[PDB]
Amino acid sequence: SLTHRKFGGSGGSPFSGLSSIAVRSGSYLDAIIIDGVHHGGSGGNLSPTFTFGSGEYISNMTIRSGDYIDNISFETNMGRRFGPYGGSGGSANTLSNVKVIQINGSAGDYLDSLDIYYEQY
C-alpha cells in the first residue's frame, strides 16, 4: 500500500519529483523518458517533452495496452495535454479524477507495463 509521511516545516514553494515525460512511439510505446531517463528500446519516434509546472499533475489518463503499452494520453489539472502517442492496438483503460504521484513500470525493447501511483478522488 502506498503511504506518505511529511518531514520539516511550513516554508518554501512546493515541488514534485516528477518533472517531465516524453515517449518514443510507433505502433507501441517503445520507451518512456522520465525526467530525461530513457526506459525502453530504440524503436519508434521521439515525442516532444512535457514539463510539469509547479502545482501541476496528471488528473486524467488513457492507457491502451495488451502485452505492451500501445498508447498513452493524459491531461493535467491545469488543462494541459500530452498525446495521444502510439497506436490503436490493445484495449483502453482510463483514470479519471486522480493526482498521479509517480510513474514506474517495466521495459525491455518496448514499454511492457506502467505502474501508476496516484491518489484517486
Ligand X SMILES: OC[C@H]1O[C@@H](O)[C@H](O)[C@@H](O)[C@@H]1O
Dihedral sign for Cα 33, 73, 94, 58, please.
positive
52 binds ligand X (CB under 6 A): no
65 binds ligand X (CB under 6 A): yes
Q: Contact, 115 vs 72, CB < 8 A?
A: no
Q: Contact, 43 vs 110, CB < 8 A?
A: yes
Q: Which of residues 50-69 bind a second copy (CB under 8 A)?
A: 63, 65-69
- 3-state class (DSSP) for residue 10: coil
42 binds a second copy (CB under 8 A): no
Closer to ligand X by CB, 91 or 120: give it.
91
Closer to ligand X by CB, 100 or 111: give it.
111
Dihedral sign for Cα 46, 47, 52, 58, please.
negative
84 binds ligand X (CB under 6 A): no
Residues that bind a second copy (CB under 8 A): 1-19, 34-37, 39-40, 63, 65-69, 93, 95, 101-108, 110-120
